Design a protein around this ligand. Structure first.
Ligand code: MG
Ligand code: MG
Ligand code: MG
Ligand code: MG
Ligand code: MG
Ligand code: MG
Ligand code: MG
Ligand code: MG
Ligand code: MG
Ligand code: MG
Ligand code: MG
Lengths: 52, 127, 287, 95, 100, 110
RNA sequence: CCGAGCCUGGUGAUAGCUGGUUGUCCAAGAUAGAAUCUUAGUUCAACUUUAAAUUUGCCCACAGAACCCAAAUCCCCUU
RNA sequence: ACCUCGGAGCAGAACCCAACCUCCGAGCAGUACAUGCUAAGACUUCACCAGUCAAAGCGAACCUUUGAUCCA
């Protein structure tokens, strides 16, 4: 199944956004727009929010 | 007269004289100010740019170049504000525009650029 | 008038001639007769006819509209928000022009209330009066006014006319006393000290740009010149004015009334002011 | 609701209404949209934008809320920096 | 579903008004008529709504329509119903603002 | 309520103006309010019925009604519809004309 | 008069159920969707009544409304 | 057995509807991580709640099936 995860910005900001990834799939690292920084920055998966 | 520990003289011992609280660059007398109750009103500030001795000569030249669209045939720079119901705020905006113009004097267009480039390209006939 | 001549012609007005003004007394409707009896306007059988229809807001079991909407803090802390009654410069000029407020004396909340220019409700969390820029372009009065909040434009208008404005804080108790001093004097209590502003309001009343009553008076000329420069008027030297003493008069930050000190008791019955002389009481009322 | 309280004989306010709705003095009631905080990960950006909005109530909804609140909640409040100060009054309204 | 035409021919329509809601492409967007994600036809301008029949030339990237059109006899032309908004007001006017 | 102070120039900065002395010789008189303002008030009912009331009228309220109709018909384009309360001495005009009527009564000197 | 005595009180229990709901006269006044531990009820809508404001409303001739592959309906210049 | 939603029958020609009923599938999957933010004007499952579309603008790049409130 899929799990909702909290991608947390690697830019030092507290900005986090939620994505969906397969449980069997590896932890996610993804480029995403940082509104506070106003630039695309890397985000890393921190913790599993739920299992959907 | 009553005075507590929080009296102003105790709070700010350095400034204690009564006159200390009431002891007092664009020349408002030189400027000409008009108000039109046109809803926002309108304030117009006009002054002869050339004879503005309170403005430096190079600054006057730069202003007359850059803001030539706001200069009347009489050579007087005219600028208006209509962004408030209060003529106070409109006049404040006009004065701030004057200050900003002086400061910058001290220190859509894409299609126009392309058409001017095409005009220069067509600019080939030499008598 | 011709009406009084008609009265002269007519019979004597007595308690047998009186009639209510037509249209002021609707007929009473009661459930008797064919039209208003029988089911008496209640309808056929059911909850509504029995008089037992469910409460207001009930929707027959469907989750009610007023409950299915999420809770949001629209009114959180509403009763602790400070309220300031607006006093526009239009209203102030109107009061001065009609003589209900005397500009020759310092204008404070007591004078505004006594002239009926503003109505303050301390019980409804009114913390005083806020000066409002409305009418600034036509304000032409030289006044010494003490308010609780003041907009930059209102301050500019007051000062351009050659006047003085100061923002002074009043706690709810002092505010009630200031707004209605006579009932307080009939309470027979010594005049209390005016409390200091709460910590959140302290920067406002210590800022000179607000003309705060706790602000450094040394910084007042600089702020006044800044406003004059911003709004394009020449700052008048009020020290040269013949009313400069009145314009300079300011009550002490712990003082509720201009000429009365904290701790005094106003005996209105025989027109006297009893003043404590005990050293402890004097220290307390001066602190 | 309680039309006559047992201690004062007064009409009572349904506090569920106060916890949820804002009354503009002119007679308009503002509210949030239901579900505006629920499962945002599965909602489209347009739907989320619609849900994040402050929304007016019907005439009948407003009448119900007016009945369910007392006159205290329908007074002029001169808050210091009220974001709804401009919305408290209607302008250029014809009938 | 409550789908179908919302503005019939001759109806005055303001910019943004939905003209017709549809599941398939029963009506096609003409002049000054945009299409939503769900094939709803909305007005891009303020004006009068007109329905016409026009020759249909599918976008080349539309593989199915291109196959359909290539499997067609040499004289045949496809026709579709199109919705246009005939703009009423001009884009604007030049007004004298100042006599410098 | 204090009597308004004498001003060197009228209208006063707030726009207030005392009634002229002597009073006009019109068949009707409009007494000022106790706050020394012209008694012309907007009124609203049903949320859509806008009216204006001239309230403290003495004398020929019918003469006042004729004058008000003459003054307001060019503005409206039609004769305004009015109610003359002869008992209470008031004139009620359909529509909002408070500012125009206040200016007009000032010109007449009430 | 006991599948749970009798009396008093709480108590004017509660009843979406049944029954009843008293002068005269006039006027306007009709079936209708949704939700509901809901279909013997209710709330919203629709209809209905009163008062008020304003300007268009109904009828409709053309023109117009899809491919897959009937009777009519919608819309509105006139009238 | 069903109870919510969606698609088709089932309504020949705007909408609405043959409820009850027949068949199918969804409590999602894939994709992207601007698949952002804002905002005129509209639609709407005949109420409300809810649900849709969207010009212009700003910013990056250069989409195809459900559940309120309270409470945590
Ligand atoms: Mg009957
Ligand atoms: Mg009965
Ligand atoms: Mg019934
Ligand atoms: Mg009234
Ligand atoms: Mg027995
Ligand atoms: Mg009973
Ligand atoms: Mg009848
Ligand atoms: Mg239930
Ligand atoms: Mg029942
Ligand atoms: Mg179906
Ligand atoms: Mg709808």
């Amino acid at each position: 199944k899929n799990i909702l995860v909290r991608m947390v910005s690697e830019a030092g900001t507290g900005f986090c956004f939620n994505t969906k990834r397969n449980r069997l799939r590896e932890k996610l690292t993804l480029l995403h727009y940082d509104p506070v920084v106003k630039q695309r920055v890397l985000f890393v998966e921190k913790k599993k929010i739920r299992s959907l | 007269e009553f005075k507590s520990i929080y009296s102003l003289d105790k709070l700010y011992p350095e400034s204690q004289g009564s006159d200390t609280a009431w002891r007092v660059d664009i020349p408002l007398d030189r400027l000409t100010i008009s108000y039109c109750r046109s809803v926002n009103s309108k304030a117009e500030v006009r002054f002869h740019l050339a004879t503005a001795e309170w403005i430096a000569e190079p600054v006057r030249q730069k202003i007359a170049i850059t803001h030539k669209n706001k200069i009347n045939r009489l050579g007087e720079l005219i600028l208006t504000s209509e962004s408030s119901r209060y003529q106070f705020r409109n006049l404040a905006d006009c004065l701030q525009k004057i200050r900003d113009m002086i400061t910058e004097a001290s220190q859509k267009l894409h299609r126009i650029r392309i058409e001017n480039m095409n005009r220069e390209r067509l600019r080939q006939k030499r008598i | 008038a011709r009406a009084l001549d008609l009265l002269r012609g007519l019979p004597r007005v007595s308690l047998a001639n009186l009639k209510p003004n037509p249209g002021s007394k609707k007929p009473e409707r009661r459930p008797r007769g064919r039209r208003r009896g029988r089911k008496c306007g209640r309808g056929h059988k059911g909850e509504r006819q029995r008089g037992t229809r469910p409460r207001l807001g009930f929707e027959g079991g469907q989750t009610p509209f007023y409950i299915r909407i999420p809770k949001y803090g629209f009114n959180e802390g509403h009763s602790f928000r400070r309220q300031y009654k607006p006093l526009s410069l239009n209203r102030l000029q109107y009061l001065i022009d009609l003589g209900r407020v005397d500009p020759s004396q310092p204008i404070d909340l007591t004078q505004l209330v006594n002239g009926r220019g503003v109505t303050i409700q301390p019980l409804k969390r009114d913390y005083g009066v806020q000066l409002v820029e409305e009418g600034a372009d036509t304000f032409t009065a030289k006044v010494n006014i003490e308010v609780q909040l003041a907009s930059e434009l209102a301050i500019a208008a007051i000062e351009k006319n050659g006047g003085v404005v100061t923002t002074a804080f009043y706690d709810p108790r002092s505010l009630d006393i200031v707004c209605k001093p006579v009932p307080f004097f009939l309470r027979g209590q010594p005049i209390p000290k005016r409390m200091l502003p709460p910590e959140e309001l302290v920067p406002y009343y210590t800022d000179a740009k607000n003309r705060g009553y706790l602000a450094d008076p040394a910084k007042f000329p600089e702020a006044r010149l800044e406003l004059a420069r911003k709004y394009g008027y020449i700052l008048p030297d009020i020290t040269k004015d013949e009313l400069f003493k009145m314009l300079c008069t300011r009550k002490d930050p712990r003082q509720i009334f201009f000429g009365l000190a904290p701790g005094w008791v106003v005996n209105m019955a025989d027109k006297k002011i009893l003043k404590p002389t005990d050293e402890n009481l004097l220290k307390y009322y001066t602190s | 609701l309680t039309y006559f309280s047992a201690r004062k004989g007064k009409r009572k306010t349904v506090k569920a209404v106060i916890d949820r709705f804002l009354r503009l003095h002119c007679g308009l009631w503002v509210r949030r949209k239901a579900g505006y905080k629920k499962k945002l990960w599965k909602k489209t950006p347009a739907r989320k934008k619609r849900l994040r909005e402050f929304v007016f109530c019907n005439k009948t909804q407003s009448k119900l809320l007016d009945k369910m609140t007392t006159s205290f909640w329908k007074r002029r409040n001169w808050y210091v920096d009220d974001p709804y100060q401009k919305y408290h009054d209607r302008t250029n309204l014809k009938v | 579903r409550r789908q179908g035409i919302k503005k019939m021919e001759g109806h005055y329509v303001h910019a943004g008004n939905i003209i017709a809601t549809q599941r398939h492409f029963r009506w096609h967007p003409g002049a000054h008529v945009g299409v939503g994600k769900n094939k709803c036809l909305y007005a891009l301008e303020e004006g009068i709504v007109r329905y016409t029949k026009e020759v249909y030339v599918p976008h080349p990237r539309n593989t199915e329509a291109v196959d359909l059109i290539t499997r067609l006899p040499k004289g045949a032309v496809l026709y579709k119903t199109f919705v246009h908004v005939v703009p009423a007001k001009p884009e604007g006017t030049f007004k004298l603002v100042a006599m410098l | 309520i204090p009597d308004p102070p004498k001003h060197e120039h009228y209208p006063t900065p707030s726009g207030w103006q005392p009634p002229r002395d002597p009073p006009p010789n019109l068949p009707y008189f409009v007494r000022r309010s106790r706050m020394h303002n012209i008694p012309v008030y907007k009124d609203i009912t049903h949320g859509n019925r806008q009216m204006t009331v001239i309230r403290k009228v003495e004398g020929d309220i019918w003469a006042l009604q004729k004058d008000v109709e003459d003054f307001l018909s060019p503005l409206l384009g039609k004769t305004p519809v009015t109610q003359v309360n002869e008992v209470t001495g008031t004139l009620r005009i359909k529509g909002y004309f408070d500012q125009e009527l206040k200016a007009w009564l000032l010109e007449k000197g009430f």
